[PDB]
Amino acid sequence: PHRAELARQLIDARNRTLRLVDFDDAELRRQYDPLMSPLVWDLAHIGQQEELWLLRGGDPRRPGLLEPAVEQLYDAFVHPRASRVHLPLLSPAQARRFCATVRSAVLDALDRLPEDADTFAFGMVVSHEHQHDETMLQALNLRSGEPLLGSGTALPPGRPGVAGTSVLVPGGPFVLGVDLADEPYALDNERPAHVVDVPAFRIGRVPVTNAEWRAFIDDGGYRQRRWWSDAGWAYRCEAGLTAPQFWNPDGTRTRFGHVEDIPPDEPVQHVTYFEAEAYAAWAGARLPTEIEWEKACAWDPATGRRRRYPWGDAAPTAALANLGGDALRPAPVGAYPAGASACGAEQMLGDVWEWTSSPLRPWPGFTPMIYQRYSQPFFEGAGSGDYRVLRGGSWAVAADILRPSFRNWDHPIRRQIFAGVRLAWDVD
Numbered sequence: 001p002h003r004a005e006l007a008r009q010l011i012d013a014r015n016r017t018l019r020l021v022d023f024d025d026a027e028l029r030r031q032y033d034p035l036m037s038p039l040v041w042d043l044a045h046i047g048q049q050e051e052l053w054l055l056r057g058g059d060p061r062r063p064g065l066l067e068p069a070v071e072q073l074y075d076a077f078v079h080p081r082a083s084r085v086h087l088p089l090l091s092p093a094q095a096r097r098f099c100a101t102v103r104s105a106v107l108d109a110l111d112r113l114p115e116d117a118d119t120f121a122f123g124m125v126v127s128h129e130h131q132h133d134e135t136m137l138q139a140l141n142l143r144s145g146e147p148l149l150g151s152g153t154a155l156p157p158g159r160p161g162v163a164g165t166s167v168l169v170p171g172g173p174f175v176l177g178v179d180l181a182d183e184p185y186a187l188d189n190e191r192p193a194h195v196v197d198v199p200a201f202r203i204g205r206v207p208v209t210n211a212e213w214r215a216f217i218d219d220g221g222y223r224q225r226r227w228w229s230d231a232g233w234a235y236r237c238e239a240g241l242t243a244p245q246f247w248n249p250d251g252t253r254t255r256f257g258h259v260e261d262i263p264p265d266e267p268v269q270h271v272t273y274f275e276a277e278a279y280a281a282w283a284g285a286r287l288p289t290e291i292e293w294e295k296a297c298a299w300d301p302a303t304g305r306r307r308r309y310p311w312g313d314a315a316p317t318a319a320l321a322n323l324g325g326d327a328l329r330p331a332p333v334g335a336y337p338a339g340a341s342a343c344g345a346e347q348m349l350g351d352v353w354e355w356t357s358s359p360l361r362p363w364p365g366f367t368p369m370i371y372q373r374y375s376q377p378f379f380e381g382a383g384s385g386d387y388r389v390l391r392g393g394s395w396a397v398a399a400d401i402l403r404p405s406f407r408n409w410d411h412p413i414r415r416q417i418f419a420g421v422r423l424a425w426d427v428d
Ligand SMILES: C[N+](C)(C)[C@@H](Cc1cnc[nH]1)C(=O)O
Pocket: 128, 131, 132, 135, 374, 407, 408, 409, 410
């Protein structure tokens, strides 16, 4: 954009990272849960990736500041999450120094770029850092002990008449995905824009709420195999799933270490894919595909055009959506009437990542970005296991890095992510 805007975005992302590691060294070296890296791992990994993509042209053979064997400690493919706490990692002080040295060079490089030069990698790195910021928040939410973070900033109230209800998404062709001409920092798996015919379906006006989930529990939803897939039931049994994560036996939840009542009208959060599909079956519904989800979010059947955001082309604001990390929770359903998509689906962007039934797959004409291993290894059948796509972002996602076309994904057994559920239905 303006190089000044990119600098602003990089600085904002780093400010966020540094808030998330503004704790004593022992905290940053802890493993909060075997699913998660120590925070000091993400810190150095953020710098290493910034250096690689912005200072080294994505070519590991070009020299970097770290010995290659030290650099490789931050290769997520080489080192499983649980192992990272035991690796001979850079100290927090070393990691901060490294990140700052890299950043000084990156800001200089951005100054020196020729006019009209391509800046894609800079936006890709902003996205990368913010996504690790959300990972670090997942870790801090898993941490046992007295809270390190506050309970979150104020959110708007919800309103009646939206929970449980659905909106119609009329059938026909729509444009899935985006091109760089329209979204200059869209990641490779969002491209290219192409037409898909999506039959009529209905989608939830708002996500499934906590009170609705409690009804599933109360009716024996976790005790009735018929709602679950074979794999989902097996996992429910193996893992002993009886409620969303962080829901306590006494009816409270624990959120960033804060014990509190469970708000009835918030979107349910911290459920697996398997739980989501079981709830949906029990409720008389199903999960959306990600293609259905994106049509509900972005398509305006009155103009036969995509919108940039569900509400139109205005930049996200606190009045339109719950984004950016400060709330530490999703908002009550109905809190953002002005953020509705053309079909009336609300809170599509922000609040909770929403599970879909789609595996990650390339759009026709997919081509990888400079970080070639960002999407490709996780496509269906690529050999990294089973994934399902999640859409829309959560409360933790930076507005700068989110689009209707953005695709998250995870293994269906994961629920430490800030994920919930929106229902869908066939139309006859
Ligand atoms: C798209 N997710 C969120 C699944 C990715 C983003 C990512 C960060 N560094 C490489 N990729 C992930 O956390 O592994």
